[PDB]
Symmetry: T
Subunit: 153 residues, 12 copies
C-alpha cells in the first residue's frame, strides 16, 4: 500500500468497495435498461431521468474502482456481491421501474453508510469522506424517484 | 444612521426632474415587492412539487423564478439609479405586494400553478398601468423596460395557462 | 426565368441525365413532404397544451429543427445534382407525400398521431427512393437517404413511446 | 377543437375586442414571413455565379432570421388565443406579397424579389403596430418594433447588394 | 401544511428528520434574509470603492442563493416543508435583518459580516446535531456551506481592515 | 465623392426624405457625440491612475466599447436611411453636442465628472431626437434610441455612484 | 412495429441486436476493469486508452439498445448471449489485457458483420447501416490495440 | 518498406486487403496533390471575388486533409503502407497537378473542379471493388468521402456559373 | 490639466527621458494615424455597397478592430512611458501621417485605394520609428512595432489583392 | 511590518485563539511542504526525458498545478483564520515537511520516487493536522484537509502505477 | 496561360523595393518546401508508428505536423504578399527541400524520431541564416516571423531530442 | 547524472560558448521570477483594506503571469542543455533583488516592493537580452523581448497603483 495505511484496514475497506461497486454496476445497467424501454405519457421525463441517473451512478463506480485499485485490491460475481435484488426480465410498469430503482438505491445507501462507519472507525478518512460524497447524491436520487412515485397530477 | 430612509429620496444623475422620478420610483417598488414574492413562491414550488408531471414543473419553476429574479434585479438597479430606495424588509415586502402570497405548506401541483398564474396576471396589470404612467410623464426608458418585462412575463403566464388546459395523452 | 421546374441541367460530378432526373424528382417529392411535416411540427409546437405540454413543446420543436436539417440537405444535394427545389405553396402542397393536418387546434393525442402518420408516409418514400438511387448507381444520394431514414425512424420511435398506454 | 375562425380567451387580461384584431394582423404577418423564409431558403439553394458565396451565406442567415420571426410571432399569437396559419392554402391566401414563381432566377432578380417582399411586409408591420398601440397592448407593439428594426436592416443589406457599384470597372 | 412531516425514502427515523429539518428551516430563513440584504447592498452601494462592493455583494448573494436552494431541496427530500412566506421567514431568521433605507458601504459590510457570523454559529450547531443523530449527508452539506460562509466572512473582514493606498 | 455629405438619397424601406433628413441629422450629431465620448473614455482607460486605478481602468474600457457599439448601430442604420455618417475630424468637432475634455491628464474625479456631463448632454440630445422620431412616425429609430438611452442612463448612474462622498475611508 | 417493417425481419434483427449488446456490455465492463487496474511503465497510455475505449463501446450499447427497443424487442443472460470469452479474475499482464481486448473486439466485429448481412438481405437498411457505422470504429480500435502489441520501442 | 503488406487484426484476407490498400494509396496520393493545390490557391488567389475563393480554398484543403488522414490511418490499420515521398506521390496521383505559377482565379476553380471529378471517379470505383470483396467499413468511408467530394464539386461549379450582380 | 500635453514625466522602468520623449512622440503620431484609420475603416464598414458589398463589409470591420487593438497597445504603453496620448480632434488632425479621405461616399475601389495608401504611409512611419527605438536601445517598443508592422503589412496585402484586375467576370 | 510571523490576530468567524494558533502553524508547515513539492514537480516537468518522457511531462505538470491549487487554498484559509503564510526561501526551506531533491538532473525513476516520498511525508502531516483540527473543533479546516488529502493519495496512486514492474 | 510563372515576380504592396523582397521570397521558398516535406513525414509517422510508446509518438507526431503546417501557411501567405510564387509541385518540393526526406516504408520508432530531429535541425539553420539575411536587408517583419517560427521549432527539436535520451522506467 | 555545474550538449546547433552564458543568465532570471511569484502569491493572500479586492485580484493575475514566465524560461533553459534552479538555497543566492521579509506589510509597502522587484528584473532581462543578441541566438532574444514587454506593463500598472491621486479628496 502506497499511502501508509496498515494492511488491516485496506483489506476491510476494499471488501466493502467491491460490494458497493457490484451494487452500483447493477444499478447502472438497470437504469440503462429503463432509459431504453420506458414508454407512456410521461415517458420523456423518465427517458431523460434514467439517462441522467445511470451516467451518475457509473461515476460512483469509476472512482470507487479507481480508488479500490489504489488501496491495493482488485475491483470486481457482480451477481454474487450485489446487495439488492436485480430487475427480472421484460419491461415492467414505468411505476414499478422507478419503484425497483427506489429500493435498489435505498439498500445501496444503507451499505454505503455502514462502510463509511467502518472507514471512520479505523482511521482512514478519505474513504469515509468519499462514501459521504456519494451518499448525499444517492439520497438525492431517492428523493427524486419518490417524487416520481407521488400520488398527484 | 440610515443616510437615505425608505420614504426619503434625493437627486438622479440623468437630468430628469422629481415630478416623475418619484412617481416612477414608488411605482417600481410595488412591482419589485410582488416580483420578489413571486420568486420566493416559484422557488418553493421548485422545491416541493411531486407527482406525474413533477419533472416538468420542477424545471419550469426553476426557469421562471430565474426570469422573475432578473426582472427584480433590473428594476432595483434602475430604481437606485433614479434616486429611490428598494424594498427589502419582510414587513414591507409583504405590505407592498400587489397579490396575496401563497400560505405556507405543500399544495397540489394544479393549485400552485393556479396561484402562480393569477399572481402573474395581477403583476401584469400593475406593470401595464406603470408603463402608461412612465409614458405620460416622459420617462422613456422606464416604460420600455416595463414593456419588455411585460412581454416575457406574459409569455410566462402563457406557459402557465398551458399547463392548466384540460387535455393530455392520458384518458382523463 | 433562367431554368424552370421541368428543365434539367448537367451535373458536375459525372452522372448521367437519367439518374439525375429520377433521383431529383424523388428528392423534390420527399423535400416537399419534409417541409410540410416541418411546418406541421412547428404549429404543433405552437398550439400543444395540457398536462404533458412541456415534453411535447420540446419534442415538437426539436423535430421541426431536425426536419429543417433534412430539408437543407436534400435541397442542396438536389440543386447540386442539377434540379431545382420546390418552394411555391401550390407545388409544395401538391407533391407533399401525406395529407397535411387541416388548420385549427387539435388534441395533443391527435396531433401526435398526425405527425407519426406523416413521418411513416415519408419513411415509405425515403426507403423507396433509397432503393431507386441505389439501383441507378447514385451512391452519395443513397447514403444521404439512409441517414435521413434512420433518424426519421428514431423520431417514429419517440412518437410511438408518446402514444403508449402507461401511467 | 378550435378551428381557424373561432377564438379562445386570453389569460393576460386583454379583451377579445383587441385580441381578434392583433391575431389576424399576426396571421397576415406570419404568412408573409413563412413565404419569405421559403424564398430565402430556395435562394440559398439555387444561387450561383461569381458572387455566389456571398449570396449563399446571406440568404441562409436571413432565412433563419425570418424563421425566428415566425416562431416569435406564432408563439405570441397562440398566447392571445388565436390560431396560426400553416397549410399552403391559407399561407398563399393571407400572404402580404406575391411569392416568387418556381425555377432558378437571376442573382439580381431574386435579390430584388427579396427587397420587394421585405418592403411590403415592413408596410404591414408598421401600420398594424400602430394599430396594436391604439388597442392598449404595449408588449406586441414593442415586439413589432424589434421585428421592424431587424427587417429594415435586412432591406438595407439587400438594397446595398443591388447598388450600381463594383470593383469591376464601368 | 406547515408544522408537519411526512415519511422518508432514505431510511432515517423521524426522531432525526424532524430535528434536522427544523434546523434546515432556520438556516434557510436566515440565508434568505442574507440573500435579500446582499442584493439590497448590490443595489444601493456607492462611494469611492463602490465597484468592488458591487461585484462582491452580487457574488455573495448568488453563493447564498446556492446555499438556500441546496438546503431547500434536501429539506423537502427529508420530508419537511421549506419556509416561503414573509411572516415565518421574519420569525425564524436567526439574525436581525438590516432596516429599510440606504446605509454607508462600511456599515453595510459590518452588517453582512455579523450576519454571516451568526449564521455560521447556527450552521455549526445544527451540523453537530445532525452528526449526533447519524445523518451524515446533512452533516457534509452543512460543512461545505460552513467553509464557504467562513470565507465570505474572511473577505468581509478584509474589506473592513484599516489600511489603504490613501493615507486614511 | 459620389454621394456628397449633406446630400441624402432614397431609402429602400418606404420613408420619405422629410423624415429621413431630420432623423439622419440627429443620428449624425449623436454619432459625433458618441465618437468623441468613445475617444474620451478610451483616453481615460489609458491615463487613469491612483488608489482606485483598477476599478476605473475596467469601467472606462467597458463604457468605451459600449459607446462604440452604439456607434455601429447608429452608423449602419443611418447609411441604411440614405444619409452619410460623420467621419471627418473637423465634422465631429463641429457636431459635438458637448465640449470634449481639454488635453492632458486630469484628476480621476474630474475625468469622471467630464464623462458624466458628456453622458448627460447626450442624454438630452437622445431624448429630443426620440421625441422627434416618434412624432414623425419612425418607430424603429425611436426604439433603438430608447435602449441607447437605457444603457447610457445606467452608465451615468454608475459614474455618479463613483462620485459619491462615501468610502471605507474617512471623507 | 411503428416503421412498417414486417414482424419477420424485426424479430431476426432484434435477435442479433441482443447478441451484440451483451458482447458490447461485457467489452465495456472489461475495458473499465482495465482502465482501473493497469500499472507499469506505459500505464498512463493504457490508463487513458481503456477509458477512451469503454466510453466508446458503451455508445454502441446505448444506440443498439435505443433502436432495439425501437424495433419492438426488449434489450438484455448477458453472460449467455455474449459472443466472446470474458476476462478471468485478477489483474493480468498489461499485454494480455490488450490481447484479451483485441480478440474480444475481433469476434464482436465478426458477428456485427453477419448481422449487417442479414439486415441487408431482408430489406431493413438502417440496421445494416448502423452496423457498418459501429464496424468502422471497432475495426479502428482493433488497429490501435494491435499497435499497442507491436514488438518495437 | 513499400510494395509489401503485413497481417490484419480484423479478419480480412490479403486477397482483399492488398487490393483495397492499393486503391487507398492511389486516392491518398491524389488527395494530397489536391490539398497542396487548394493550399496554393488559398495562397495566390486575388481579384474581384478573392475573399470568397480565399475562404473556400482554405475550407476545401482542410476537408481534403481530413480525407487524407482518415484514409491513411485506415490504410495502415489494414496492413498497408501510406505514400509520403514526392516521387511516388507524383507517380500514383490519378490527375495531373497544376504546374507551378499563379493562374487566374477562374482557371484555378476549373482545375480544382476537374481534379475533384477525377478523384470522384477513382473513389467510386475503389468503393465498388471494396464492396465486392466484402470490405464494408472501407466501403462506408469511401461513400462518406464521396458525398462531401461531390458537394465540393457542386460548389466549384457554382463558382464557375455565368451569372453575377455585374452585367458581365 | 495636472499633466499637460507635451509635458512628459518620469517612467518606472528605468528609461531616460531622452528616449521616452522621442518614442512617445512617435507613438503619438502613429496613434493618431491609426485613430484616423480606425474611423475611415469604420466609415467604409458603414457606407460600402455594390456587387462585392459583403466581402468588404466584413473585411472593413475586421480591419478597423485590428487597427483599434493597435490603438490600445500603443496608448497603454505610451502612458506607461510617462507621456500622454492624443485624444483631441484637432490634435489627431495635426498629427495624422496621411491625408484622411474627404467626406461623402466614394466608389468602393477608391475607398480600398485610400485605405491602402493610409496603411502604406503608416508602414513607413512605423518602420522609421522602429529603427529609432532600436538605435536608442528600446527593444520592447521596437518588438511591438514589429508585429504591428507584420499585421498591417498583411492588411495591405489583402487590400491590394482586392485591387487586382482579375475576376470570374471579364475585365 | 504591521504583523510578523509569530503575532497571531483575531478571526472573524468566532474561533478561539488556541485553535487559531494550532491549526495555522499546521497550515504553514504543510503549505511550505506543498510549495517545495510544487517546485520539485515543476523542475521535474522541466528535466524529465527518456522513452516515457511524454507521460511524465504531462503528469509532472498536472501535479504541480494541483499542488498550486492546494497552496492557494491553504494560504487563503490561513490568513483568513488570522495567521500569515510563509513566503521567504529560508523559512519555507526550514518548515518543509521533507528534504527537497538536491538540484541537478536525476533519473526519471529517481525523480518519480522523490516525488512519491515527498507526497507521503506530506500526507502524514495532512492526516495528523486533520485529526488535530477535528479535535479543536475547526470543522471547515478539517474538511479542507480531507479534500487535499484524498487527491494527494490519488497522486500517490498514480506514482505507484508509474513505478510498477510491468512491460 | 500562367500569369506569374515560378521564377518571375512582380510588385509588393508595402513599399519595399525588389533588392530584398526577391531575396527574402526565394529564401522563403526553401523553408516552405522543407517544411512541407517535414509535415508529410510527420503525418506518415502519425499513421504508422507502433510499439511500446506508440501512443505518445502518435499524438506527438500529429501535434508537430500541425505546428509545421502553421509555419507553412504563414510563410506562404507572406510570400504571396511580398510578390513571390509558392512552391507546390512535387518536382520542386523535392528539389528545394533543404534536408533529405525519409524513403518510403515503415521504420522503427527510434529511426523516425532521428530522421525528424535532424530534419528539424537542418531547417533551423536555413531559418537562422534567412533571418540574418532579412535583418541585413531591412525587412523587419520577415526576420521577426522567422524568429518566432525559430523559437517553437527549436522547442519541437527539444521534445524530439527528449524522446531519444537513454533513460526510462524500464530496466534498459 | 547532471549536477548544477556541468552542462550538456544542445540539439539545436548552438555552441556551448553561447549556451553556458545564456543558461546562467536564464537561471538568474528564473530565480528572480520565482521570488516574485512567491511574493505576489503572499500579497494575494494577505492583502486587506479599503481597496483590498483590486489588489487581491491584481496580485493573483500577476503571480500567474510571472509563473508563466518561469515555465517558459525554464523549458527553454533545459532545451539549451543547462540545469534549472529549484531549491531555496540557490534561489536565494541567485535572485536578482532582495525578497520581501515575512509578515503582512502595508498595501503601499508591498505594491512598492513589487515595483522594485519588477524594475531590477527588467534591468537584468534587458542587458542580458543584449548579450543573447551578441551571441547569435535570435530566438531567446525574441523571447526576452516578449517577457520584457509584459513585465514593463506590470511595472506600469504597479506604478499607477501608487500614484498620488484618488476620489477621496486631498
Ligand atoms: Fe494496484
Ligand atoms: Fe447477491
Ligand atoms: Fe441612488
Ligand atoms: Fe399587500
Ligand atoms: Fe445548379
Ligand atoms: Fe399531394
Ligand atoms: Fe392556446
Ligand atoms: Fe395573398
Ligand atoms: Fe416531499
Ligand atoms: Fe427572528
Ligand atoms: Fe447608403
Ligand atoms: Fe460643437
Ligand atoms: Fe417498445
Ligand atoms: Fe455465452
Ligand atoms: Fe501496421
Ligand atoms: Fe500520375
Ligand atoms: Fe502616466
Ligand atoms: Fe497632418
Ligand atoms: Fe488577515
Ligand atoms: Fe525542514
Ligand atoms: Fe502576390
Ligand atoms: Fe533537394
Ligand atoms: Fe535536457
Ligand atoms: Fe541574491
Ligand atoms: Zn480514471
Ligand atoms: Zn431536483
Ligand atoms: Zn446588477
Ligand atoms: Zn415555449
Ligand atoms: Zn446549404
Ligand atoms: Zn430517446
Ligand atoms: Zn452550401
Ligand atoms: Zn417557443
Ligand atoms: Zn433543484
Ligand atoms: Zn455592421
Ligand atoms: Zn451590416
Ligand atoms: Zn437515449
Ligand atoms: Zn490513432
Ligand atoms: Zn489519427
Ligand atoms: Zn488596457
Ligand atoms: Zn491596463
Ligand atoms: Zn513540454
Ligand atoms: Zn485567493
Ligand atoms: Zn487515474
Ligand atoms: Zn491563410
Ligand atoms: Zn479570494
Ligand atoms: Zn512545458
Amino acid at each position: 500500500n502506497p499511502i501508509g495505511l496498515e494492511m488491516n484496514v485496506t483489506t476491510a475497506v476494499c471488501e466493502g468497495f467491491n460490494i458497493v461497486l457490484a451494487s452500483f454496476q447493477a444499478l447502472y445497467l438497470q437504469y440503462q435498461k429503463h432509459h431504453f424501454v420506458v414508454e407512456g405519457s410521461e415517458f420523456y421525463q423518465l427517458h431523460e431521468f434514467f439517462s441522467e441517473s445511470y451516467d451518475e451512478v457509473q461515476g460512483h463506480v469509476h472512482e470507487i474502482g479507481e480508488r479500490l485499485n489504489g488501496l491495493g485490491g482488485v475491483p470486481v460475481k457482480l451477481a454474487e456481491l450485489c446487495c439488492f435484488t436485480p430487475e427480472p426480465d421484460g419491461v415492467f410498469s414505468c411505476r414499478a421501474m422507478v419503484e425497483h430503482d427506489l429500493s435498489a438505491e435505498q439498500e445501496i445507501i444503507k451499505v454505503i453508510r455502514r462502510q463509511a462507519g467502518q472507514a471512520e472507525s479505523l482511521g482512514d478518512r478519505a474513504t469515509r469522506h468519499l462514501y459521504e460524497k456519494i451518499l448525499l447524491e444517492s439520497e438525492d436520487r431517492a428523493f427524486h424517484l419518490s417524487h416520481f412515485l407521488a400520488h398527484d397530477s
